[PDB]
Amino acid sequence: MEGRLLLLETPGNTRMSLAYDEAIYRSFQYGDKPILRFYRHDRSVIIGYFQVAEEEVDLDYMKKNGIMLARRYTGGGAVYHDLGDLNFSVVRSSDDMDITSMFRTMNEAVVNSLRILGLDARPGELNDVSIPVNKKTDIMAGEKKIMGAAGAMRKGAKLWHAAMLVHTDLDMLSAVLKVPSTRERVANVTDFVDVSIDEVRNALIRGFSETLHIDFREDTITEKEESLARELFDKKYSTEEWNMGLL
């Protein structure tokens, strides 16, 4: 019932940030304390594990506006992040491989969280990874998408991470990601309520704590975890074969 709240970031370096995630996920052993990580990324585009960089983004537009190109451990679509986006991930013990339940429980915690801020949201309905919005892995505010999520599961452990749009540049996001309006399909938490990043963070902290019945206490990353992260970074996340999609 005791948990770890990690306010671990790496702005300026999206690739190292993703490395931390896989690091806390891979070092984790069945029975450890649940982990809740909050973090942000500066202007960058993150694609899923099975994606092909040159199939969702124009490497040129990103070379022009200084958008970092990073690829994550989990599948799913391509997203645009900037400091207006509040990313967070949960790592806990797992006794099965049921993906549907993880997303259902996590989305439940997020809904309870935004309620606290007076924002009534709901999870998407469709079971289609290809469609941009209204997926069961998304959280909707009315008809607009405000949060996207992906995850992975292995024997004894599961990972779930999300990206919520608090005050992100919805135009820019639309411009960088190819789909085929999108702009008209997403929205920021602040379109509904005037709240800061921390307020949304503190809201989610209570939400996940109350929903999951886990007392998350601010903690720091461990040497073991930090080492593995540097490891994952140096040998994968900081390489082109991985970020392009060849590794």
Ligand X SMILES: Nc1ncnc2c1ncn2[C@@H]1O[C@H](COP(=O)(O)OP(=O)(O)OP(=O)(O)O)[C@@H](O)[C@H]1O
What residues line the site for ligand X (CB under 6 A)? 46, 76-81, 85, 132, 135, 137-138, 145, 147-150, 163, 165, 168, 173, 177, 179, 182, 186
* Nearest CB to ligand X, comparing residues 166 and 229: 166
Amino acid identity for residue 235 in this structure: K
Between CA 12 and CA 227, with CA 21 as vertex, the angle to 5 degrees is 85
Q: How far apart are CA 180 and CA 177, in angstroms?
A: 9
* Nearest CB to ligand X, comparing residues 4 and 135: 135
* Nearest CB to ligand X, comparing residues 135 and 201: 135
Pick from 19, 22, 26: nearest CA to 41: 19
Whether 85 has a binding-site annotation, put simply, is yes
Q: Minimum distance between the CB of residue 239 and Mg ion, rounded to whole angstroms?
A: 26
Q: Minimum distance between the CB of residue 240 and ligand X, rounded to whole angstroms?
A: 20
Whether 163 has a binding-site annotation, put simply, is yes
**Is 162 within 8 Å of 89 (Cβ atoms)?**
yes
Whether 72 has a binding-site annotation, put simply, is yes
Amino acid identity for residue 215 in this structure: D
Neighbours of 233 (CB within 10 A): 21
Counting other chains too, the contacts that 219-222 makes at CB distance below 8 Å and 24 or more residues apart are 219/4, 219/5, 219/6, 220/6, 220/8, 221/6, 221/8, 221/20, 221/24, 222/27
Q: Minimum distance between the CB of residue 182 and ligand X, rounded to whole angstroms?
A: 5
Q: Minimum distance between the CB of residue 78 and Mg ion, rounded to whole angstroms?
A: 11
List binders of Mg ion among 125-154 (CB under 5 A). Answer: 137-138, 148-149
Residue 92 contact, options Mg ion, ligand X, none, Cβ 5-8 Å cut-off depending on partner type? none
Query: Could you tell me which residues are beta bridge partners of residue 186?
Result: 145
Check residue 48 for interaction with Mg ion (CB under 5 A): no
Pick from 199, 216, 54, 55: nearest CA to 119: 199
Whether 138 has a binding-site annotation, put simply, is yes
* Nearest CB to Mg ion, comparing residues 138 and 225: 138
Q: Minimum distance between the CB of residue 47 and ligand X, rounded to whole angstroms?
A: 8
Q: How far apart are CA 39 and CA 81, in angstroms?
A: 11
| Residue number of the CB atom closest to Mg ion | 137
* Nearest CB to Mg ion, comparing residues 73 and 233: 73
Residues annotated in the binding site, as ranges? Answer: 72, 77, 80, 85, 132, 135, 137-138, 145, 149, 163
Indicate the annotated binding residues for (R)-lipoate: 145
